[PDB]
Amino acid sequence: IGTGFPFDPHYVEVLGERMHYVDVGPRDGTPVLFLHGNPTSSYLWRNIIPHVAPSHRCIAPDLIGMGKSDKPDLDYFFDDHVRYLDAFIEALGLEEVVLVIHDWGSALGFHWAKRNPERVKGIACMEFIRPIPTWDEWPEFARELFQAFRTADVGRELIIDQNAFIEQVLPKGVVRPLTEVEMDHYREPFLKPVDREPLWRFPNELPIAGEPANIVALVEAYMNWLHQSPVPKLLFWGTPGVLIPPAEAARLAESLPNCKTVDIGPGLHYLQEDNPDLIGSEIARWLPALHHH
Ligand SMILES: [Cl-]
C-alpha cells in the first residue's frame, strides 16, 4: 500500500479562499469526484485514484480548512462546507459527475446529489453518514469517546488541544497499522493546534440522538432521496465496519435501488487504508455501464 502522494497541486479561489485539489485523467468525459471526510484529505484517495484515472478524470478536493486548502477562522459547520463545495464544483464547470464518497464527504455528496439529481450518474460510497437515532445505535466501543467529543470543554481539549482525531481516532479506524510517513501526511494540515477547529465541529455535527436537529433533518432528507433514487450505487463495506456493519450493508443492498455491495474484507472506518486496490479496481470496473443515458 503506497505512502506517497504523487499528484500535482491544483488550486481554485472560491468564496475568498483557495481550495487545493487533485485533477488527473482525460477532460472529455464524465469526471469522478472523490470527497473525503474527517480528519482526512485527498491523501485518503491516493491509492484508489490510480485505478480510475486511466479511464476517467479524477478530481479530489481538500475540504475548506483541511488538507492543502486554506484554513480561514470559520465555525466549520456542515453548512460552511456545503457552501465551499458547491462553489468548488461550479468553479470547475462540472456538469454531470460520478461521486465517490466517505464519512462527511458522503453527507456533502448525498446532499449535493439530492439537490442536483440529474447531474449524478452514480454514487460509490463507504462508511457513510446516516441518522444514528439514539446513542445505543452508535458503536459501543466509540460511544464514551464521541460523547466526550460533543462537549465545549472536554471535546475541545481532546480534539484541538491534544489532537485526538488525528492521533487516536484515525489509526483506530484502520485495521492495519498506519506507518509514520502516512501519519505525517495526515498530521500536516493540523500542525498548528488552532487549525483543528473542523476536526471538533464535525463530530458535533454528527446526527446522533436527534442532535443537532438541522443535520438530522438534512441527513433524513438525503436518505429518503437515496432510498427512492434509481441512481446506480456501489457500496463498499468491511468487517466489523464502524458506521456500516456487515448486517447494515446487507440491509442497504436490499433497501437501496440498483445497489451493488462489495465486501473488502477486514475494515473499520477508513476502508481506503485497508483495501484501496479492491475499492479502486471495483469502481473502475463499474464506471462504463453508467455512461449511457
Ligand atoms: Cl466526525
- Domain ranges for the chain, please list them: 1-293
Distance CA 115, CA 118 (A): 9
The DSSP call for residue 211 is: B
Cis ω before 39 (30° cut-off from 0)? yes
The DSSP call for residue 258 is: T
Number of DSSP helices (H) and strands (E) in the chain, helices first: 13, 8
Experimental method: X-ray
Please list, in sequence order, all residues whose beta carbon lies within 8 angstroms of the beta carbon of residue 284, skipping any fewer than 6 positions away: 51, 52, 54, 55, 56
Contact 99, 113 (CB under 8 A): yes
Look up cell 477508513; give the residue: 270
User: How far, in Å, from the CA of 288 to the mean position of ligand 1?
Assistant: 33
Residue type, 15: L
Collapsed DSSP state (helix, strand, coil) of residue 17 = strand
User: How far, in Å, from the CA of 192 to the mean position of ligand 1?
Assistant: 19
Strand partners, 24: 58
Q: Which of 112, 113, 100, 98 is nearest to 37 (CA)?
A: 100
Contact 35, 108 (CB under 8 A): yes
Helix (H) or strand (E) run with residue 255 in it: helix 246-255
User: How far, in Å, from the CA of 240 to the mean position of ligand 1?
Assistant: 19
- Which runs of consecutive H residues, i.e. helices, occur in 150-195? 154-156, 164, 170-172, 180-187
Which residues have a beta carbon within 5 Å of ligand 1, which is an ion?
38, 202-203
CATH architecture, range 1-293: 3-Layer(aba) Sandwich (3.40)
Residue type, 98: V
Data resolution in angstroms: 1.7
Positive or negative, the CA dihedral 126, 95, 254, 134 is: positive
Catalytically active residues, by annotation: 103, 127, 269
Distance CA 165, CA 175 (A): 16
Distance CA 197, CA 124 (A): 28
User: How far, in Å, from the CA of 38 to the mean position of ligand 1?
Assistant: 5
Distance CA 285, CA 17 (A): 36
